[PDB]
């Protein structure tokens, strides 16, 4: 009558991610109910339905002055481990994983006073060459035009372009799934103002929401700070 | 309430071919889909629907000259571990096993120039005697006639003849399931040519497909190279 059993080789090993649970030692606990609002279910939701504020030289905005031309104003290696992301939600959430996937939405909010106006070419430059350095160089690529004084805020979608079914949340010395390109805002014109002695510059905030097709995978543990 | 169990004698032993699987430690991984063509299912398929090229003195063809007669031109011990197979697919696939079974198809492609013509007696000689040495000797056995200049290529099926329900993928000092016979091509006539100063010889490629009734069994590990 005793069952006939063979003790599988690993038998007394631990393994920290067992798909199964441990034995209860305090049953019959009924818990008090909770109304408490905003219970989130999945982390991608807040990342999608929520704008984070970028990071450039310490501040979450870039400047336009009454003097600029083709000098690129905003530039970033499209990688989660990119600079201008460092501060943000999305970026930091992804540290909790290995692979990211999808487009990201950028929100630029021009905040210069109403007496003021200006325009920019926000463009996305595909990860080949050696990075453009003037508007007339980027223009040949995917970009749109933003005339602050039509919308004082604009959204721009940095797409997902890669043989890579998934991408690298933890970038490094340039690999084929390490980068997806470059986001660049350029100054189409300069700062026109009612009176240039008062308004000489403008601050465009730049926020980052997660893409609708955005997803993350393979949870990971934290390496040495660096 | 605890179940009553007896620990079967082998209990903590390993065994590398368990018909069962190990415990998961990283669940919920959904994988990206693959269109990618030509996924094969079973190795016998490519072996059947695919011709390999034989091996004779280093080259994958045999020669006919304007001088030959009954000297056998192509000869091979019907065994997978035979010489003229060494290079091929079928032969090498079988190394992965212990027993083979069935007929094999031979494809001879005469490749001498069109100004040229010749004929051969491809014959199969059953594993008894001590091997024939002239056409007029083999002729009494299973063979057909190939007049290059009717078909420039011909197929010949080396059958399975044995009390052996299966045969030896790993042959050796002659046993009863070690060999199934001998394939021999002989020169029926010689090389007739428009101008013998240009075309004096002909090269018949010889390829090997797996037989429709061909099968393999009992996967094995690799011994010392030799």
């Amino acid at each position: 009558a005793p069952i006939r059993v063979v003790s599988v080789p690993e038998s007394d090993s631990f393994m920290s991610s067992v798909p199964d649970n441990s034995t209860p030692l305090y049953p019959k606990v009924v818990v008090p109910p909770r109304q408490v609002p905003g219970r989130f279910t999945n982390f991608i939701d807040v990342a999608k339905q929520t704008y984070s504020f970028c990071s450039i030289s310490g501040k979450p905005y870039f400047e336009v002055t009454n003097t600029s031309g083709d000098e690129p104003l905003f530039q970033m290696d499209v990688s989660l481990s990119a600079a201008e992301l460092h501060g943000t939600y999305v970026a930091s959430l992804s540290s909790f994983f290995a692979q990211y996937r999808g487009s990201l939405n950028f929100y630029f909010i021009f905040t210069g006073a109403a007496a003021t106006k200006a325009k920019f070419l926000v463009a996305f430059v595909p990860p080949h060459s050696a990075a453009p350095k003037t508007r007339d160089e980027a223009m040949a690529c995917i970009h749109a035009v933003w005339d602050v004084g039509l919308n004082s805020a604009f959204s721009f979608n940095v797409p997902y372009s890669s043989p890579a079914d998934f991408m690298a949340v933890y970038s490094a010395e340039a690999t084929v799934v390490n980068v997806s390109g470059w986001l660049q805002v350029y100054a189409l014109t300069a700062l026109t103002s009612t009176d240039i002695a008062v308004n000489s510059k403008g601050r465009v905030l730049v926020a980052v929401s997660a893409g609708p097709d955005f997803s993350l995978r393979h949870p990971v543990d934290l390496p040495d700070k660096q | 309430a605890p179940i009553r169990v007896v620990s079967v004698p082998e209990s903590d032993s390993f065994m590398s071919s368990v018909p069962d699987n190990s415990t998961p430690l990283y669940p919920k991984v959904v994988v990206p889909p693959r269109q990618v063509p030509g996924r094969f299912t079973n190795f016998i398929d490519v072996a059947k629907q695919t011709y390999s090229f034989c091996s004779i003195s280093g080259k994958p063809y045999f020669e006919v000259t304007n001088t030959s007669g009954d000297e056998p031109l192509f000869q091979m011990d019907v065994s997978l571990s035979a010489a003229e197979l060494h290079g091929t697919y079928v032969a090498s696939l079988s190394s992965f096993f212990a027993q083979y079974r069935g007929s094999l198809n031979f494809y001879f492609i005469f490749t001498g120039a069109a100004a040229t013509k010749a004929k051969f007696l491809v014959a199969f000689v059953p594993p008894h005697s001590a091997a024939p040495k002239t056409r007029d000797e083999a002729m009494a056995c299973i063979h057909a006639v190939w007049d290059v200049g009717l078909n420039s290529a011909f197929s010949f099926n080396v059958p399975y003849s044995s009390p052996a329900d299966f045969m030896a993928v790993y042959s050796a000092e002659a046993t009863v399931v070690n060999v199934s016979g001998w394939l021999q091509v002989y020169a029926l006539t010689a090389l007739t040519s428009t101008d013998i100063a240009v075309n004096s010889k002909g090269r018949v490629l010889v390829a090997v497909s797996a037989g429709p009734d061909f099968s393999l069994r009992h996967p094995v590990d690799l011994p010392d190279k030799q």
Binding site: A1, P2, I3 | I3, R4
Partner: peptide, 21 residues
């Protein structure tokens, strides 16, 4: 008489014990 488990029939009625006619 005194056999009371469920696994008591882990083995067959034929194999386990003896059988009358």
């Amino acid at each position: 008489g005194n056999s009371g488990s469920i696994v008591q029939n882990f083995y067959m009625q034929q194999y386990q014990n003896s059988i009358d006619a």
